[PDB]
Enzyme design. Structure first.
Site, short mmCIF file in Angstrom:
data_model
loop_
_atom_site.label_atom_id
_atom_site.label_comp_id
_atom_site.label_asym_id
_atom_site.label_seq_id
_atom_site.Cartn_x
_atom_site.Cartn_y
_atom_site.Cartn_z
N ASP A 35 -42.50 -3.94 -9.49
CA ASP A 35 -42.57 -3.23 -8.17
C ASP A 35 -42.65 -1.79 -8.36
O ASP A 35 -41.65 -0.95 -8.46
CB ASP A 35 -41.44 -3.49 -7.27
CG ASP A 35 -41.35 -3.05 -6.13
OD1 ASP A 35 -42.36 -2.62 -5.39
OD2 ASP A 35 -40.07 -2.89 -5.41
N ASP A 218 -48.24 0.28 -4.14
CA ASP A 218 -46.89 -0.27 -4.27
C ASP A 218 -47.22 -1.78 -4.71
O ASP A 218 -47.38 -2.79 -3.85
CB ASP A 218 -46.06 -0.23 -2.91
CG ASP A 218 -44.87 -1.08 -2.88
OD1 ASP A 218 -44.52 -1.62 -4.12
OD2 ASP A 218 -43.93 -1.00 -1.87
O1 LIG Z 1 -40.11 -5.72 -0.05
C1 LIG Z 1 -40.01 -5.53 -1.43
C2 LIG Z 1 -40.14 -4.30 -1.79
C3 LIG Z 1 -39.26 -3.51 -2.27
C4 LIG Z 1 -37.95 -4.00 -2.47
C5 LIG Z 1 -37.09 -4.74 -1.41
C6 LIG Z 1 -35.79 -5.08 -1.69
C7 LIG Z 1 -35.10 -4.83 -2.96
C8 LIG Z 1 -33.73 -5.02 -3.18
C9 LIG Z 1 -33.33 -6.22 -3.92
C10 LIG Z 1 -33.78 -7.20 -3.81
O2 LIG Z 1 -33.54 -8.38 -4.88
C11 LIG Z 1 -33.91 -9.76 -4.55
C12 LIG Z 1 -34.99 -10.00 -3.84
C13 LIG Z 1 -35.33 -11.54 -3.77
F1 LIG Z 1 -36.42 -11.48 -2.81
C14 LIG Z 1 -34.87 -12.36 -4.52
C15 LIG Z 1 -33.89 -12.09 -5.55
C16 LIG Z 1 -33.48 -10.66 -5.41
BR1 LIG Z 1 -32.10 -10.16 -6.77
C17 LIG Z 1 -35.77 -4.09 -3.68
C18 LIG Z 1 -37.06 -3.44 -3.48
C19 LIG Z 1 -39.32 -2.04 -2.32
C20 LIG Z 1 -40.77 -1.62 -1.96
N1 LIG Z 1 -41.61 -2.35 -2.41
C21 LIG Z 1 -41.85 -3.85 -1.91
N2 LIG Z 1 -39.64 -6.51 -2.02
C22 LIG Z 1 -39.39 -7.94 -1.40
C23 LIG Z 1 -40.71 -8.94 -1.21
C24 LIG Z 1 -41.83 -8.24 -1.54
C25 LIG Z 1 -42.94 -9.31 -1.21
C26 LIG Z 1 -42.79 -10.58 -0.71
C27 LIG Z 1 -41.53 -10.87 -0.52
C28 LIG Z 1 -40.48 -10.15 -0.74
CL1 LIG Z 1 -38.97 -10.82 -0.17
C29 LIG Z 1 -39.18 -6.54 -3.53
C30 LIG Z 1 -40.62 -6.01 -4.31
C31 LIG Z 1 -39.95 -7.72 -4.30
#
Ligand SMILES: O=C(C1=C(c2ccc(CCCOc3cc(F)ccc3Br)cc2)CCNC1)N(Cc1ccccc1Cl)C1CC1
Ligand SMILES: *[C@H]1O[C@H](CO)[C@@H](O)[C@H](O)[C@H]1NC(C)=O
EC number: 3.4.23.15
Length: 333
Positions: A35, A218
């Site tokens: 990411d 991103d």
């Molecule tokens: O939305 C995001 C993005 C970001 C993000 C969001 C939340 C976090 C906190 C940590 C989250 O940690 C987890 C998330 C899980 F789904 C499963 C297990 C864990 Br541990 C860190 C980064 C930052 C900016 N870029 C996208 N996701 C969640 C996501 C993205 C795309 C589809 C579904 C989901 Cl849940 C992270 C990159 C994967």
């Protein structure tokens, strides 16, 4: 050094792209999103209560099974949109393809059920800069650069449609997955994978971002996003209808939607309707979702557009730490 490391990715429903890493001795493996929009490594902790649905269905890192673990325990917290994600800091050996790196990461002990329960992956590997790392924890790519093994201090992303789901390359790019040469844009500033955008066009005419705007590139975002106001305008121009969590068009109207172009550096990057409509039907009686959403990203990084998988599927992307720039080339599928 003369190393490249590649990791095969899985494409879940065009919205999640994830590949494997191993943590600990012996390695505990996790599916993770790589990411560019964040800077920390997160995996669920074995200490996450089974009463969190966001943990119950994912793999959990168990420090008590790793001989190479080093305790830290500093709390770290992310005030995410739907609730708090918190955990604690730990250090262990992480393998990503051919590369083995001693890395500080967060073990999550609580996080909201939505959206995280709907993730098919177990964790996140932030490919962003230390400037945006929670706790200023040294990011994984910084630690890999420090090993002095990579052929070049760049990493590249191929996202397929849907067969290979995708590929990340550490230390270079894979010419098998793109055509021609890269075109580059410098980061506005080091610390964020974010570039200037010079306009967004529908068909032949610039509709939005006329005075200029920001584009976060991103790899962890599913969609192209813009501010609520920009997206309202774009969707008006498309004739798209707003729902509570997305925008839709009558499925029959999908293939006739206009091109959308993003002016980045010296080039227009054009998505056709096929690149941004989820054509689940061609029926006039059904509604089809668009792979473009509103997201108001707060300071410091926002307000900004974000170019996520919708964009990256079409344009193979290289993130160059040596030169603080992003390069795009047309992907080969
Ligand atoms: O939305 C995001 C993005 C970001 C993000 C969001 C939340 C976090 C906190 C940590 C989250 O940690 C987890 C998330 C899980 F789904 C499963 C297990 C864990 Br541990 C860190 C980064 C930052 C900016 N870029 C996208 N996701 C969640 C996501 C993205 C795309 C589809 C579904 C989901 Cl849940 C992270 C990159 C994967
Ligand atoms: C975890 O602990 C300290 C807090 O004392 C923190 O500054 C650091 O990032 C971590 N420790 C190491 C060895 O990096």
């Amino acid at each position: 050094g003369n190393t490249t490391s590649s990791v095969i990715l899985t494409n879940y429903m065009d919205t999640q792209y994830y590949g494997e890493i191993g943590i600990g001795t012996p390695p505990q493996t996790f599916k993770v999103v790589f990411d560019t929009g964040s800077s920390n490594v997160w995996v669920p902790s074995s200490k996450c209560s089974r009463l969190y649905t966001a943990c119950v269905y994912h793999k959990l890192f168990d420090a008590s099974d790793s001989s190479s673990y080093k305790h830290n325990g500093t709390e770290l917290t992310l005030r995410y949109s739907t609730g708090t994600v918190s955990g604690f800091l730990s250090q262990d050996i992480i393998t990503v393809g051919g590369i083995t790196v001693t890395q500080m990461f967060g073990e999550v002990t609580e996080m909201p059920a939505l959206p995280f329960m709907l993730a098919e992956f177990d964790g996140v590997v932030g490919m962003g800069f230390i400037e945006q790392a929670i706790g200023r924890v040294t990011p994984i790519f910084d630690n890999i650069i420090s090993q002095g093994v990579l052929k070049e201090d760049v990493f590249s992303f191929y996202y397929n449609r849907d067969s290979l789901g995708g590929q990340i390359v550490l230390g270079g790019s894979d010419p098998q997955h793109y055509e021609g040469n890269f075109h580059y844009i410098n980061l506005i500033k080091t610390g964020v994978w974010q570039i200037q955008m010079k306009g967004v066009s529908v068909g032949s005419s610039t509709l939005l971002c006329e005075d200029g705007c920001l584009a976060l590139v991103d790899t962890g975002a599913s969609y192209i996003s813009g501010s609520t106001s920009s997206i309202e305008k774009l969707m008006e121009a498309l004739g798209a209808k707003k729902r509570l969590f997305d925008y839709v068009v009558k499925c029959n109207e999908g293939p006739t939607l206009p091109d959308i172009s993003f002016h980045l550096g010296g080039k227009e990057y054009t998505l056709t309707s096929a690149d941004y409509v989820f054509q689940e039907s061609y029926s006039s009686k059904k509604l089809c979702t668009l792979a473009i959403h509103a997201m108001d990203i707060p300071p410091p990084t926002g307000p900004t557009w974000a170019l996520g998988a919708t964009f990256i599927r079409k344009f193979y992307t290289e993130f160059d730490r040596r030169n603080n720039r992003i390069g795009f080339a047309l992907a080969r599928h």
